[PDB]
Structure 1
Amino acid sequence: LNALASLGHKGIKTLRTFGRAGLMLFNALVGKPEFRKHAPLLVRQLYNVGVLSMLIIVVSGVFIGMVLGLQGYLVLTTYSAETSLGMLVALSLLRELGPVVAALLFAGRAGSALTAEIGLMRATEQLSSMEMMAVDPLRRVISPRFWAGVISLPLLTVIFVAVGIWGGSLVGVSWKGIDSGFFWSAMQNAVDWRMDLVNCLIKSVVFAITVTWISLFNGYDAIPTSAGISRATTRTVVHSSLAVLGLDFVLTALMFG
C-alpha cells in the first residue's frame, strides 16, 4: 500500500532524529575537561538562563500560592479543619506544582530563548567560523549552556516553593485569621525531608535535563532561515510541555504510589 510505505518513511526519519540528538549531547559533554576556559562561559550563560528567569518565577509563585490558599480554605472550613491549611499548601507545592509549573514556565521563557539563540548562530555562520579556527563548537557553545540549565532550574524551583508558601500564609493567616501558631506547626510535622524535600529535587533535576536537551537540540537542528528558526522555537514549547507532564505522571506513581 502507498500509505504503509509513507508511514514507515516517517518512522525511519524519526529514528535518526533521536540518533542525531544522542550524538549532539555525547560529543558536547565528553572529553578534555577545560575547567578554566569554561568557567567564565558558565557565568554568562547562568545570567541568560537563570537571572533573566527570576521575574516570571517569583511573580507566578506568589499568585499560585494565593490561589491555593484561597481555594483550599473554602474546602477545609466545612469540616472545621482550616488549621491544616499550611499542610495542604506546602504539600501540594512540594509535589506536583513546584516542579511542574516552574518547568513549564522555564520551557516557555528560557527554552524559547535558547532555541532562538543557537539557530541565529547558524544563520549568521558563527558556528561554521568557529570550526575554521579549529575550535569545537559543541564543547564551546553547547556545553556551557547545558550545565547552566541543569543548575538553574533546581534553583528556580526552590524559589518558587518558598514564595508560594509565603503567599499561601498571606491568605490563610493575614486575611482569613487562622492562628499562626497552629498554621506553622501543623506544616512542620507534616513535611518530611525524605518524602517531600528530596523528592522535589529529584523531579526538578529530571525536568531540567529534559527541557534543556530538547531546547538545545531544536536550535542546533533547525533550518537556518528566519521562518525555520521560528518554527523550531514553537517546537520546543510543545515537546517540552508534553515531556514534563508525561514524566510527571511516571514519577508520581513511583514516589507516592
Structure 2
Amino acid sequence: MNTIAWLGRLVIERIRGIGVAALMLLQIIFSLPSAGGFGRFVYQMHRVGVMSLLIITVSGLFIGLVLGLQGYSILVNVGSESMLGTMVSLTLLRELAPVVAALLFAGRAGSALTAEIGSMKQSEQLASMEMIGVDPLKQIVSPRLWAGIVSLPMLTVIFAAIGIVGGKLVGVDFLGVDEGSFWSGMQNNVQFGHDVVNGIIKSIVFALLCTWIAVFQGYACDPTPEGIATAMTRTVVYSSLCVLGFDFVLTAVMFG
C-alpha cells in the first residue's frame, strides 16, 4: 500500500516528465539558428564524433573476427565455405551495425552529453547563462543535438566496413578460404537498396532516441552530484531499452 502508492507516484511523475522532454524537443528544432551556430557545430563533431572514432574500429575489427571464426567450422562439414561471406555480411548489416553501434555510442557520447550539461547545472553555469541572457536551448543544446544526429550514421557505416574487412583477415589469411567465392557470395545476396540503405534508416532513429535523451537528462536534473549518476543511468537505461525496443518494429516493417 505505502511503497506501492509510492512507486505509482514515481511512475506518474516519470511519465509526466518524459512528455516534457517532448515539449523541449520542438522548441529546439523549430527555430532558425543564427550565425556562430556552425562554428560550435563543428566543435561538437570534434567533441562527439572524432573522439568516438578510435573506439568503433577496434570493436569493429573484433566481431567479424569472431563471427566468421566459429560458424564456418560447423558449416564446413556439409558443403559450404562459400556462404561464409554472406552470413558475416547479412548479420552485421541488417542486425548488429544498427544495434551494437549505438550501445558503444550511448556508452561514450551518450554520457558526455549529460555530464557536460551536468557540469553547467552544479556550478550554476547554466543559470548564469540565462542571467547574462542567452538561451542554452539555442546555445548549448542545439549544436549538441545536431552533432549527435549526424555523427552516428557517420560511424556505423565506418563500423561495419571494418567489420566485414575484419572477417576477411581471418578467412583468407588464416583459414585459407577462396577470395572469389568470398566476395561473390556477398554480391549475389546483399543488395544495396534493401540492406545497406535500410541499415541506415535503422541507424537514424537509433541516433535520435539515443542523443535526445542524453541531452534532456543532463539538462533537467538536480545539481546533486550523487543524482548526476542516477541521471546518468537513465540516459543509458532508457536508450538501451528503446534502441533495442525499436529494433523489433524496424525489423518487422522492412521484412517479414
TM range (shorter): over 0.9
Q: Is the 8 A contact 2:60 2:160 kept in 1?
A: yes
Deviations 1:78-111 (A, max 9, x none): 2221111111111111011111111100001110
Q: What is the distance in 2 between the residues matched to 1:199 and 1:187?
A: 17
Deviations 1:176-235 (A, max 9, x none): 111101111111121111210111000100100000011111101211022121221122
Deviations 1:105-137 (A, max 9, x none): 000111011111101111111111111222111
The letter for the 2-side match of 1:175 is F
Q: TM (normalized to structure 1)? A: 0.95
Q: What is the distance in 2 between the residues matched to 1:29 and 1:139?
A: 9
What is the alpha-carbon root mean square deviation over aligned residues? 1.5
Partner of 1:113: 112
Q: Does residue 212 in structure 1 map to residue 221 in structure 2? A: no
The letter for the 1-side match of 2:66 is V
The letter for the 2-side match of 1:207 is F
Counterparts of 1:173-192 in structure 2 under 5 Å? Answer: 173-192=172-191
Partner of 1:29: 29
Q: What is the distance in 2 between the residues matched to 1:256 and 1:172?
A: 30
Partner of 1:79: 78
Partner of 2:15: 15
* Number of equivalenced pairs: 256
Q: Is the 8 A contact 2:33 2:138 kept in 1?
A: no
CA shift, 1:2, in A, is 5.4
Partner of 1:48: 47
Partner of 1:97: 96
Q: What is the distance in 2 between the residues matched to 1:138 and 1:129?
A: 14
Q: TM (normalized to structure 2)? A: 0.95
Q: Secondary structure at the match of 1:82?
A: coil
Decide which moves more: 64-73 or 231-240.
Answer: 231-240
Q: Report runs of 4+ in structure 1 exceeding 3 Å deviation.
A: 1-8
Q: What is the distance in 2 between the residues matched to 1:9 and 1:229?
A: 21
Partner of 1:63: 62
Q: Secondary structure at the match of 1:33?
A: coil
Q: Does residue 221 in structure 1 map to residue 220 in structure 2? A: yes
Identity %: 59
Does the C-alpha gap of structure 1 residues 71 and 211 become closer, same or farther in structure 2, counting only changes over 3 Å? same
Q: What is the distance in 2 between the residues matched to 1:232 and 1:210?
A: 16
The letter for the 2-side match of 1:61 is G
The letter for the 2-side match of 1:125 is E
Does the C-alpha gap of structure 1 residues 102 and 27 become closer, same or farther in structure 2, counting only changes over 3 Å? same
